[PDB]
Amino acid sequence: KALDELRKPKFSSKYLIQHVSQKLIPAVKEWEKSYQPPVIHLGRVLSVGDGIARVYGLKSVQAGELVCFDSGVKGMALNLQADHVGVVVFGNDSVIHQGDLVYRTGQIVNVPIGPGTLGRVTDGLGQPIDGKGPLTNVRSSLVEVKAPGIIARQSVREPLFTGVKAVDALVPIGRGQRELIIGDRQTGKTAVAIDAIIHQKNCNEQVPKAQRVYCVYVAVGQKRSTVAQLVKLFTQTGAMRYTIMVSATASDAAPLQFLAPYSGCAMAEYFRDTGKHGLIIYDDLSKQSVAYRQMSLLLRRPPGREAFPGDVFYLHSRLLERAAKLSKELGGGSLTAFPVIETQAGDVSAYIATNVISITDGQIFLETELFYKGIRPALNVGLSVSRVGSAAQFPGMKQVAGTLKLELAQYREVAAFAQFGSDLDAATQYVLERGARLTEMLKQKQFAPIPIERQTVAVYAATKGFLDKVRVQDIVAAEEAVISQVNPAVFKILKANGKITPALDAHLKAELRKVKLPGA
Amino acid sequence: ADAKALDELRKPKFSSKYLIQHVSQKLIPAVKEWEKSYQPPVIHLGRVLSVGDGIARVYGLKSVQAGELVCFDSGVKGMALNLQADHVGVVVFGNDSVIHQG
Amino acid sequence: GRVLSVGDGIARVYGLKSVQAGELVCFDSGVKGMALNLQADHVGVVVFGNDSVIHQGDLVYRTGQIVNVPIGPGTLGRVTDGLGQPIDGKGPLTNVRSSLVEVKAPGIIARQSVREPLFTGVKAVDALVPIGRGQRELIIGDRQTGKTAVAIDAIIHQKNCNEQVPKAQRVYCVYVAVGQKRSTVAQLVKLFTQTGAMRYTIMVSATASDAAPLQFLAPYSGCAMAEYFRDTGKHGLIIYDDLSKQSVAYRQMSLLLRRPPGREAFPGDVFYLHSRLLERAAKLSKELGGGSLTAFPVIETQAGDVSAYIATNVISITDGQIFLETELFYKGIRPALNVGLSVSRVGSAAQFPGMKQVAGTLKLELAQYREVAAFAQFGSDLDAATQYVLERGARLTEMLKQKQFAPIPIERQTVAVYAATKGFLDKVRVQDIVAAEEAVISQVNPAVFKILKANGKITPALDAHLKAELRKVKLPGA
Amino acid sequence: SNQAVKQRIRAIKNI
Amino acid sequence: LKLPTAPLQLSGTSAQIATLLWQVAAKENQLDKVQDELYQFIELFKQHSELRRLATDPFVPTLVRTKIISSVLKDSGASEITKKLFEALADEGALSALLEVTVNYEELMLAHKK
Amino acid sequence: PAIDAGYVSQVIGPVVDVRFDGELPSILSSLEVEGHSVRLVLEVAQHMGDNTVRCIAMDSTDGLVRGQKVVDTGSPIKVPVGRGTLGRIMNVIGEPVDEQGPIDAADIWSIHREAPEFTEQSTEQEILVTGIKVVDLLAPYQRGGKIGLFGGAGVGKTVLIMELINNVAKAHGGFSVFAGVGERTREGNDLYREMIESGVIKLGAERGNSKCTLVYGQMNEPPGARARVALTGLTVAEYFRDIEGQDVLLFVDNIFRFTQANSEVSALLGRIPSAVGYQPTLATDLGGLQERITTTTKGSITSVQAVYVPADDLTDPAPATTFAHLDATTVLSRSIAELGIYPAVDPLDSTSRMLNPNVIGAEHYNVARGVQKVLQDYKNLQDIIAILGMDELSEEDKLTVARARKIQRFLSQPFQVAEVFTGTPGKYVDLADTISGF
Amino acid sequence: SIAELGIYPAVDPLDSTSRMLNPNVIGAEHYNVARGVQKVLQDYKNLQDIIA
Ligand SMILES: Nc1ncnc2c1ncn2[C@@H]1O[C@H](COP(=O)(O)OP(=O)(O)OP(=O)(O)O)[C@@H](O)[C@H]1O
Ligand SMILES: Nc1ncnc2c1ncn2[C@@H]1O[C@H](COP(=O)(O)OP(=O)(O)OP(=O)(O)O)[C@@H](O)[C@H]1O
Ligand SMILES: Nc1ncnc2c1ncn2[C@@H]1O[C@H](COP(=O)(O)OP(=O)(O)O)[C@@H](O)[C@H]1O
Ligand SMILES: [Mg+2]
Ligand SMILES: [Mg+2]
Ligand SMILES: [Mg+2]
Questions:
Q1: In whole angstroms, what is the distance from residue A126 CA to residue A122 CA?
Q2: Can you tell me the distance from the alpha carbon of D14 to that of A191, in angstroms, rounded to the nearest whole number?
Q3: DSSP letter assigned to residue D14
Q4: Are the C-beta atoms of residues C102 and C260 closer than 8 Å to each other?
Q5: Residue A443: which of A484, A481, A479 has the closest Cα?
Q6: Which residue has its alpha carbon closest to ligand 3 atom 11?
Q7: Is F79 in contact with F232 (CB distance < 8 Å)?
Q8: How many CA atoms lie within 13 A of C255 on its CB side?
Q9: What dotted CATH number matches A108-393?
Q10: Is residue F146 annotated as part of the catalytic site, yes or no?
Q11: Whose CA is nearest to atom 23 of ligand 2?
Q12: Domains in chain B, ordered, with CATH?
């Protein structure tokens, strides 16, 4: 039969009725007098749902262009399909109906950056939520920017002092690298980042204006009460004048959580482009990858491993590559990134964890087994790498850091032999007790950053045996006794001269002999 | 829609002829004036409907055997693995870049 | 309505604009169906039976009402499939009334606290993990460890008790065989009719040859047939044999409808599948009739895999858990109940009070025997305090053995338990206790068992007479 | 964590 | 802006075109004219091969199909509704949806013709 | 009534599509079905784009025909809140299911609302003594915080939450709201009788003197109802916090059932599934719930949310997402419950933000850290005790083994509610006494 | 693992393979040394279970 070829329809489109109704409703003779909705610069919402709106129209919209619904909520045009535009929603999608108008704004996504952003608890879109008014001394730059090239960078030289003894000796961090703090839940990651912020408050009042570090903390997917406690803490220490709090919490919409580290990186790149130094902590980057996974899976993109999209490596790559040490022709600024990736029961062979480990230079693996051994911070010293190495390590700390790494390397292999109490060797016992001295030396209470000169003196006093006479159980207070009972001149000249000179290593060699240790 | 309400259009049901009479004389010069922007219709031949990643979906080819060496007009050979209802999905022995849509 | 397409356990049915979601439709070939997915352009129909008799173009008639099975007192004794058609070959179901399989379980205000026990006749479970009427007690075990034997002895003891009690407290069992072999259901029907337990039992059998929605719907058919007895003031007992097989059949149903699978390729609502079913086993209040329904879900694990998906699903729904270990089954100890894992939440508040005050020391001695056997596997030292309670626990585990298909009444359970836990069966060689407790039940006067069933508590006169009677026992081993 | 269980299997077999 | 309601609701993406066609031709009260025109187009697809080649061939460009459907339907007293319908259905290659848009239109008109 | 009366278009399980001729309702609004056997409330979840909403039904859809008229309420699901709800049991749509007449309603609040903002948050850290030794020692509960009781399928998180109700909920002074999200109906009846017998629920005309409101959507309910009963319990608690302005308790049982009900619904909305089989919008739905359970400046909601883990798997995404929203975490383990220890709190995985040397004192903090150190050094030697035996260890290691075996037995405690099945009477321990004991 | 022991460059001596290791293309004086080094290293990893 000749009718069978036209039996079943072969559609090249889905919203065919939406194209037919733009040509049949003018065929009514009474509806030719401007009875047509324009779709050149406007757009009608076809289907809302789950924080995803699909908009018919928007012919002149750009990919990644921030559009605005007529309800007031904004949105980012992400999928530019052949017959509609898949628009994510930056807020609650309860305010959107089918048939609402979408007014595009012509702007790729913008956040207020500048010197007036300091101390402002803002979202991943730019609105402050701390209740201190709008942003005043700011300017509106792009969210997604191109990373600096190969000309625009120089070598990572100057160190970024953390204040934590387990990381400033073993895993040193220079001003301009990307150092990952990877661990499990409740292992000390956010606390290490907060110590890295509070040490900048302790440091910035001793250095000039060109050497100050302005922190930016990006809380993605956390609670609102956690960011409230952190704002209370940074105000109680007074470090809010150096800190920007970008906060897209768990109540906030999924594209806000997706764009929070990008917004924070744009707010922290202002100090990098103006010769200052910046420090950004993309806290809970795995929750940002989860928010991007949800935003893509509702946008009908084909999923891959663990139902993530393909370009989720690119998602963290183009975010982390904006952290660099610029050359002197471009201002000499720096941005030191600190991603935080949570693993689940130690599976480091996951997808997002391997991607962020493959991107970043260093890694700080905090383990939940050594957290409950009393070793706080829970730094696994074997797996932690720092690929600047001794190029940006503090001099003086470099004189004892090789000894610390080698002695802890022997103490890591002396294990599985200490469970036989009569099996004395008198040489593996010496390194076995020396490793306990060095391990319990590197403990710190939280929210207590130690300056780098006192760290160098305190680890010098332990790698040279000046706390070797005490027991293994009293080194947490003998450390404080060694810090207090020495002359204040030793730290005062060690911070200034830059290294342990031969004109100092005979002074504090004897100043450790006039100390009182609580054990003999 | 169902088939029962769709078979009954095979019988003529217009009860007027003010459209099928006039445009039946207009349609042949209308398809004559766009003879240049056509392609010759393929029944026992095969026209490439799409091509990608070394796989060309070939419209036509009404009498291929499943697994028959088809040969493109680029000189590259193929192998009709799956035969769909409307098109033939062949594979490409070599460079897929010398095969365009058409 | 016409059939558009049939395959993968679904019938895309054109038309039926007046059909309901969940309406029992009936094809022209006689095979039934359920209008599951009411789409905008067709009606998805799962096929209760073999779909090889259904073509494109077959007519689908609606029956006018939701999927219903004939329930009532005419089902007692009739072996039905998942829709209540009798396959025993004894004619149609007379004296019956059709009612729905998919009903809401009664709410918070309708249940009442479990007070009275459900005697199962196996002295191991009724002495260690006691069950009230209105209790969901999961029998979880391995493959071939004797779960079905525990359920069978429960049904047979319900038959044995049903003629010693008035009409107002009688238990009408329901056996739901999902995924079992047809041969095994035949042996079980022959056993239930040669012991006389088919006077009180319905056999709802969807065997392994039957289609997947039949194995899906057979526990709902059994639960409707037992909810007849629960709703009218009588009592009910129901055993879902191998709910793991019912969950596998629902996995087949879900994966043949292109639904996204979750853990272990199960659908998202396999918890809701078993919560829809096991929550209808209730103990209603005094306003609704005072009826009851006791469930016994059977779960087959793989290697003691209590942490599987379906096992942890049905554990979280039921009130108790009975774990049957295979390492106690292969050492001759039958039934092989694992007392370190088996527990009844309803438990001691609603059990036999004589057993409530004779078996606390029994589980205490078994706890201390578990403490001894956890350390004395090696044969290191004999401290003469671990060794005494080691011998007491060995005598108690030998006392808690049982021969199959022989359920023991509750007074002969607690007399043997009292003779075991008070030291009267001491200095007997442990391979002779299985004759010793039989002789103890045989030699104590039946007036003692009669008065102990009557008052239901060990009186101060009863134990004083029972100690003196247990001195007069010709126990082997001397 | 499906490498750690294999390494634990290898250590237990070597023991 | 103010469209008269269809007498019976229907399915999607081919019945929606028939719903809009019944709504527009009921605003214009040409409800039996366009049914005759759609019947004429069904038989016109039955007659010749150069017109069903505009709906089964996937290598016809959309420009020549749009210009053929405009230059054919320029004359012969065709309705504005059927002309703009066939223009919009030939611009998107939906000419093969004619056979199942007219059936839903007939169901709609049979609901109305009471 | 031609406009604003839509008809049911299609039904896929608990997902009902309504098609309208004009004025589609807003998302998250409640619809009513005309001529259904029970009052079936739909709730719009999407807009499908052909004048069609995609609704979640709060009851069964068995018996829905695709011609049934559906009216719009023009509002979300609104529950009766106020002081008059004290002592009532409510389902997901605010009806009484305890058969005591209608609910005395001060106001009619919807269940969909925005979370309180950043400036309305309170930053307070005061302890909540519960009497359990492991909770008051190793992970002390914040008074006005969030508490998660992880562990699954017979570890005792439902016994522990009844013990927490029995301990804190009578010595609190403020109100309480129990929101049973998909737990057993029998457990709800048990708690109703046990709260009538204890006096925190009264009947008759003296109903207002009670101090506990029950909201039950228990595990017999369809997945439309279990996805919204937590929001109803939140609305009832948020009326007391936001308007009455006083501190409450909010014990939500099995908050995994909320995520599971939304996963059962989101299988049939045609969304692409995420990791192991859950919905893609897990974290945002759980955030939009869990950020409403927060202590503001005017009041406090002290929540103890039991979290069921699936197949004892903490790397499952449904509890691992929930781990970020909790202040004090109490992980229960079955490997300790099979050792007879009760309550089976895992001491080396259950943490809290209250365990800080500035808050609870350096004595309590150092005792807790020493206990964690002793248990962790015991846990490192477990294979050596397994294969090589106790007879080759060091002296200090076989002293820490004995100290750890003493503190593992010592962390166990008989409960005031567990004595119905165990015989041992429960012991409420004070805080300084268990600190001194450890 | 060899990077954990501080030996850098952390080349695994028992997975590094080459087609230049044929004794025709480099001679016996290199192939016998390479094979002996591989043999003693694999025997040391085999004996590493009991010496640890
Ligand atoms: N140096 C330290 N001394 C003592 N305790 C510490 C130290 N550092 C961290 N802690 C404790 O460890 C915990 C670390 O929690 P943290 O802030 O790392 O949460 P997280 O792991 O980032 O995220 P989540 O809350 O999801 O687990 C804190 O509760 C803190 O009390
Ligand atoms: N109390 C008992 N005394 C003696 N033998 C028993 C007892 N209980 C069970 N058995 C034996 O155990 C074997 C299996 O028992 P049963 O058939 O009850 O297991 P099942 O739960 O059906 O296992 P499956 O479902 O995998 O077949 C039978 O051969 C039966 O003889
Ligand atoms: N403190 C305790 N002491 C003794 N047994 C307990 C205790 N807590 C829980 N259990 C055991 O756990 C069982 C029920 O656990 P439950 O609280 O229901 O956990 P879930 O709700 O996850 O199943 C009870 O039968 C009880 O025997
Ligand atoms: Mg944190
Ligand atoms: Mg069986
Ligand atoms: Mg429970």
A1: 6
A2: 40
A3: H
A4: no
A5: A479
A6: F156
A7: yes
A8: 14
A9: 3.40.50.300
A10: no
A11: C144
A12: 24-102 (2.40.30.20)
